[PDB]
A paper describes a structure:
[name]-[name]-2 variants could induce immune escape by mutations on the receptor-binding domain ([name]) and N-terminal domain (NTD). 501Y.V2 is associated with multiple S mutations, which could be divided into two main subsets, one is clustered in NTD (L18F, D80A, D215G, 242–244Δ, and R246I), and the other is clustered in [name] (K417N, E484K, and N501Y). Among 86 potent NAbs identified by high-throughput single-cell VDJ sequencing of peripheral blood mononuclear cells from vaccinees and convalescents, near half anti-[name] NAbs showed major neutralization reductions against the K417N/E484K/N501Y mutation combination, with E484K being the dominant cause.
To further investigate the diversity of anti-[name] NAbs against 501Y.V2 variants, 18 additional VH3-53/VH3-66 recurrent NAbs previously isolated based on VDJ combinations were tested for 501Y.V2 tolerance.19 Although these commonly found recurrent NAbs share similar structural interactions with [name],20,21 their reactivity to 501Y.V2 is not uniform. The neutralization ability of most VH3-53/VH3-66 recurrent NAbs was abolished by [name].V2; interestingly, there do exist NAbs that are not affected. Some of the NAbs are extremely vulnerable to the mutations of Lys417, Glu484, and Asn501, whereas others are more tolerant. In contrast to these NAbs, none of these [name] residues are involved in interacting with BD-515, another class 1 VH3-53/VH3-66 NAb; therefore, BD-515 is completely resistant to their mutations.
Author numbering:
A (entry chain C): 333 to 516, 522 to 526
B (entry chain B): 1 to 212
C (entry chain A): 2 to 131, 134 to 216
Write the structure that this text describes.
């Protein structure tokens, strides 16, 4: 009866940091994914299940729309079978992922002069995430034998680091906003 | 596959000077260059990480800046223990790369060498080879001319020499020249001399011996 | 508090080797680690890295031939080297990465990839001259060994200032020679015993040569 609310998740005013990525559930709606496809404003529109053009031609039980900010350098890791700080400790797609990964510059919005330190990523982790896991804990990383006692110092590290997003950054070091649509009754087109 | 290019290859400055090494990246690396010191024969020391941040424990005279492609590493006040090769290291793109390396040499006052000659061991002569060793023990600069006179004939093509690296406090060098010849050749002649010519020597000094 | 490496040595082209790097305060299984090598008198080459989570990455130069791994049960990081070539000769360093910054470094072990075989050295004395007061020089000649390194010390460690253990020169033999020298007071020669302790680990060669007039 009414359109899927994709402007809420794509056009939203702020995005999550990748370690605490947001996920929007989407049911009881109908939308064409071609207000998306023919936008021509996307740096990545890497799809896995289906072809991007023929997408509003099909129905699924549920669809999720995950959204975060990473470095464009790093959009490489938002795809099944990747490894790296981000695919391992921040956001991991499963090997049998069916959906699309969408990205675009954000240097206008998410870049502050002198550095927008709001956006973070998980740098330390004893073992890397399972598919679609979210770990927002902030306990001091124990790299030594000495216990950390919650105090940051040598071999006792804060697991999150802050992007120094600056407008003068090369495009690899620029903010990119990313939306991951995954598909598995109630969505159609 | 990002190529890091430092300059100079070789650098000579006297104690207390301001020394400056640059390192340029082919592509964009942001602040993810860091700077290493490798004293001769030990492993590298991390001095400055994330392009500009001083590693815990490092002297304040070391500093570096840069972001993107052009980077500068600077020693503000040169010290004697700073002879080393310094490397910049890109680390954020996969193939991690280093710069060429910058050999830093302390420049110093002239120091004339102390010269010693060593006959072959009687133990060695039993094997069939006899090696005569000549030593310059503490000199600046590295440039010295070592001539082997066996009887009174200049010898060429049978000597090899090696130099220590600069000493970490007095900034001196030491050199060993080794004349190799056969047990037969050794006992054919009698006067064995080592003539050392150096900047700080008023005139060549010879250190000789006879067999016996 | 340290990283202690071992396992490097002489290997046949096409041969295999495994390096060890055992740690004292770091926990290998919880920490970022990479292996960095340096061929003789040349630059540094990053070779491999392992992440806290276990993800491994290699430089194309050694991919498919080398493999990085760790054993928590022994707190040790290994680098397996298969299908070795000559250009793999050099010093191999292990490092603790502070998440991409290699801050603490091991002292290194030498992987020498050659077909030649092992020769232990001969230690000859470099004996003092004939001012009973002043300084006289003495030393030991370490001739004809292979492969490198050799470690020379004097009087088991009691004598360190003034010792100059020269860099080895590769002889026309294809073998190596160095010679270390030490300066002592001329009036020590009659009473004090001077011994260079040469040690050539690749051949289980330990020599103690007492230097005398």
């Amino acid at each position: 009866t009414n359109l899927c609310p994709f402007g809420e998740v794509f056009n939203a005013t702020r995005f999550a940091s990748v370690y605490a990525w947001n996920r929007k559930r989407i049911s009881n709606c109908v939308a064409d994914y071609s207000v998306l496809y023919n936008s021509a404003s996307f740096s990545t529109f890497k799809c896995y299940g289906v072809s991007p053009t023929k997408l509003n031609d099909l129905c699924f039980t549920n669809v999720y729309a995950d959204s975060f900010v990473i470095r464009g350098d790093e959009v490489r890791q938002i795809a099944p079978g990747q490894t790296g700080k981000i695919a391992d400790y921040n956001y991991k797609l499963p090997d049998d992922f069916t959906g699309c990964v969408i990205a675009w510059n954000s240097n206008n919005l998410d870049s502050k002069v002198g550095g927008n330190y709001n956006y973070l990523y998980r740098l330390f982790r004893k073992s890397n995430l399972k598919p679609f896991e979210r770990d927002i804990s902030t306990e001091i990383y124990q790299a030594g034998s000495t216990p950390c006692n919650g105090v940051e110092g040598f071999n006792c590290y804060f697991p999150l680091q802050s992007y120094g997003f600056q407008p003068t950054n090369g495009v690899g070091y620029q903010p990119y906003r990313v939306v991951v649509l995954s598909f598995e009754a109630t969505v159609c087109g | 596959d990002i190529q890091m290019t430092q300059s100079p290859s070789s650098l000579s400055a006297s104690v207390g000077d301001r020394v400056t090494i640059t390192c340029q990246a082919s592509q964009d690396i942001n602040k993810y260059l860091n700077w290493y010191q490798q004293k001769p024969g030990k492993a590298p020391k991390l001095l400055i990480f994330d392009a500009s941040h001083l590693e815990t424990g490092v002297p304040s005279r070391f500093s570096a800046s840069g972001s993107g492609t052009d980077f500068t590493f600077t020693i503000s006040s040169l010290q004697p223990e700073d002879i080393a090769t310094y490397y910049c290291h890109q680390y954020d793109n996969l193939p991690r790369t280093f710069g060429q390396g910058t050999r830093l040499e302390i420049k110093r006052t002239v120091a004339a060498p102390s010269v010693f000659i060593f006959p072959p061991s009687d133990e060695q002569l039993k094997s069939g080879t006899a090696s005569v060793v000549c030593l310059l023990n503490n000199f600046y600069p590295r440039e010295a001319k070592v001539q082997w006179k066996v009887d009174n004939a200049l010898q060429s093509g049978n000597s090899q020499e090696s130099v220590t690296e600069q000493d970490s406090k007095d900034s001196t060098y030491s050199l060993s020249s080794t004349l190799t010849l056969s047990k037969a050749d050794y006992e054919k002649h009698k006067v064995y001399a080592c003539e050392v010519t150096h900047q700080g020597l008023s005139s060549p000094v010879t250190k000789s011996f006879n067999r016996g | 508090v340290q990283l202690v490496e071992s396992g490097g040595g002489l290997v046949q082209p096409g041969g295999s080797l495994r390096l060890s790097c055992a740690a004292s305060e770091f926990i290998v299984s919880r920490n970022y680690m990479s292996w960095v090598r340096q061929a003789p008198g040349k630059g540094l080459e990053w070779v491999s890295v392992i992440y806290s989570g276990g993800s491994t990455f290699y430089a194309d130069s050694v991919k498919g031939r080398f493999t990085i791994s760790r054993d928590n049960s022994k707190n040790t990081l290994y680098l397996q080297m298969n299908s070795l070539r000559a250009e793999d000769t050099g010093v191999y360093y292990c490092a603790r990465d502070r998440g991409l910054v290699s801050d603490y470094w091991g002292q290194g072990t030498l992987v020498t990839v050659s077909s030649a075989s092992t020769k232990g050295p001969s230690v000859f004395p470099l004996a003092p001259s004939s001012t009973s007061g002043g300084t006289a020089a003495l030393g030991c000649l370490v001739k004809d060994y292979f492969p490198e390194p050799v470690t020379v010390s004097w009087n088991s460690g009691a004598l360190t200032s003034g010792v100059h253990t020269f860099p080895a020169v590769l002889q026309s033999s294809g073998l190596y020679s160095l010679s270390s020298v030490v300066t002592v007071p001329s009036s020590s020669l009659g009473t004090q015993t001077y011994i260079c302790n040469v040690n050539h680990k690749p051949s289980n060669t330990k020599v103690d040569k007492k230097v005398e007039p």
